[PDB]
C-alpha cells in the first residue's frame, strides 16, 4: 500500500538516537505526512506575526526540547500538540532524519510522522497564523524564485493563496519527497 511503502522507504533513512545525546541546544520538528485524495501531503504552519523569532515564516511544527520530554521525538509531538492540536494517538513517528546543525551550538532533529486521516488542525493563534497542506510531489517540481537564495512559491488551488517556503523547511520537504517518491512505477 501507499502508506506501507512510504514507511518502508522512510525507515531506510532513520538515523535513530545516534546524535541525540550530544550536548547541543536541542530543538525537534515534526514533518507531518497526511494522505488526502490518494496522494501524500506535508503539513506546514505559518508562524504568528507576534513571535519575535521569524514572524510569518512557513515552518514545520516543533520547538525546543524541555525537561519533560522522554526523547527528541517527544519534543516534536509536544510542540505539534501545542501548535496545531495534534494528539499523540493521531501520529505515528516513523523515523528520525538527518539532524540540522545551526549557529554552532544548536541541533534540530526532524521526525517524520504519519498523521491520522481524522485529524483536523486547530491552529493555536498565539503561535500559528495558518496551517496548510502541500502535495509531496510539488517538491519534485517546485516553482522557484530567487531572492541570492532559492524560495519555493506554492499556490493552494482551493483558494489561490500563495505561500513562500524556504530555508531548512524547504530543504527538509525536498528530502522527504525524494525519499518517498523516487523510483516508483506509475
Ligand atoms: O518552532 C518551530 C520548529 C522549529 C524549531 C527550530 C528551528 F530552528 C526552526 C523551526 N515551529 C513552530 C511553528 C509554528 C509556531 C511555533 Cl511557536 C513554532
From Swiss-Prot:
Expressed in liver, kidney, pancreas, pituitary, small intestine, spleen, heart and placenta. Weakly expressed in brain. It catalyses: hexanoyl-CoA + H2O = hexanoyl-4'-phosphopantetheine + adenosine 3',5'-bisphosphate + 2 H(+); octanoyl-CoA + H2O = S-octanoyl-4'-phosphopantetheine + adenosine 3',5'-bisphosphate + 2 H(+); butanoyl-CoA + H2O = S-butanoyl-4'-phosphopantetheine + adenosine 3',5'-bisphosphate + 2 H(+); decanoyl-CoA + H2O = decanoyl-4'-phosphopantetheine + adenosine 3',5'-bisphosphate + 2 H(+). GO terms for biological process: acetyl-CoA catabolic process; brown fat cell differentiation; butyryl-CoA catabolic process; coenzyme A catabolic process; malonyl-CoA catabolic process; medium-chain fatty-acyl-CoA catabolic process; nucleoside diphosphate metabolic process; propionyl-CoA catabolic process. A motif (Nudix box) lies at residues 64-85. Its cofactor is Mn(2+); Mg(2+). One of its GO terms (molecular function) is coenzyme A diphosphatase activity. It is found in: Peroxisome. It is an enzyme of class 3 (hydrolase). Residues 24-149 form the Nudix hydrolase domain. Its main location: other. Inhibited by fluoride. Its EC number is 3.6.1.-, 3.6.1.77. Keywords: Hydrolase, Magnesium, Manganese, Metal-binding, Peroxisome, RNA-binding. Fatty acyl-coenzyme A (CoA) diphosphatase that hydrolyzes fatty acyl-CoA to yield acyl-4'-phosphopantetheine and adenosine 3',5'-bisphosphate. Cleaves CoA, CoA esters and oxidized CoA with similar efficiencies. Preferentially hydrolyzes medium-chain acyl-CoAs and bile acid-CoAs. Has no activity toward NDP-sugars, CDP-alcohols, (deoxy)nucleoside 5'-triphosphates, nucleoside 5'-di or monophosphates, diadenosine polyphosphates, NAD, NADH, NADP, NADPH or thymidine-5'-monophospho-p-nitrophenyl ester. Belongs to the Nudix hydrolase family. PCD1 subfamily. This is Peroxisomal coenzyme A diphosphatase NUDT7. The chain holds residues 14 to 209 of 238 of the full protein.
Amino acid at each position: 500500500s501507499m502508506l506501507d511503502d512510504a514507511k518502508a522507504r522512510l525507515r531506510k533513512y532513520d538515523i535513530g538516537g545516534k546524535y541525540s545525546h550530544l550536548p547541543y541546544n536541542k530543538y525537534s520538528v515534526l514533518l507531518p505526512l497526511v494522505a488526502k485524495e490518494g496522494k501524500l501531503h506535508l503539513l506546514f504552519t505559518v508562524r504568528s506575526e507576534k513571535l519575535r523569532r521569524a514572524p510569518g515564516e512557513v515552518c514545520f511544527p516543533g520547538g525546543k526540547r524541555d525537561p519533560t520530554d522522554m526523547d527528541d521525538a517527544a519534543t516534536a509531538l509536544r510542540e505539534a500538540q501545542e501548535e496545531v492540536g495534534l494528539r499523540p494517538h493521531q501520529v505515528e513517528v516513523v523515523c528520525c532524519l538527518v539532524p540540522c546543525l545551526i549557529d554552532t551550538d544548536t541541533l534540530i532533529t526532524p521526525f517524520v510522522g504519519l498523521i491520522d486521516h481524522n485529524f483536523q488542525a486547530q491552529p493555536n493563534p498565539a503561535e500559528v497564523k495558518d496551517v496548510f497542506l502541500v502535495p509531496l510531489a510539488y517538491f519534485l517540481h517546485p516553482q522557484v524564485h530567487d531572492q541570492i537564495n532559492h524560495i519555493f512559491e506554492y499556490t493552494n488551488p482551493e483558494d489561490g493563496v500563495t505561500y513562500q517556503i524556504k530555508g531548512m523547511t524547504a530543504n527538509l520537504a525536498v528530502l522527504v519527497a525524494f525519499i518517498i517518491l523516487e523510483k516508483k512505477p506509475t
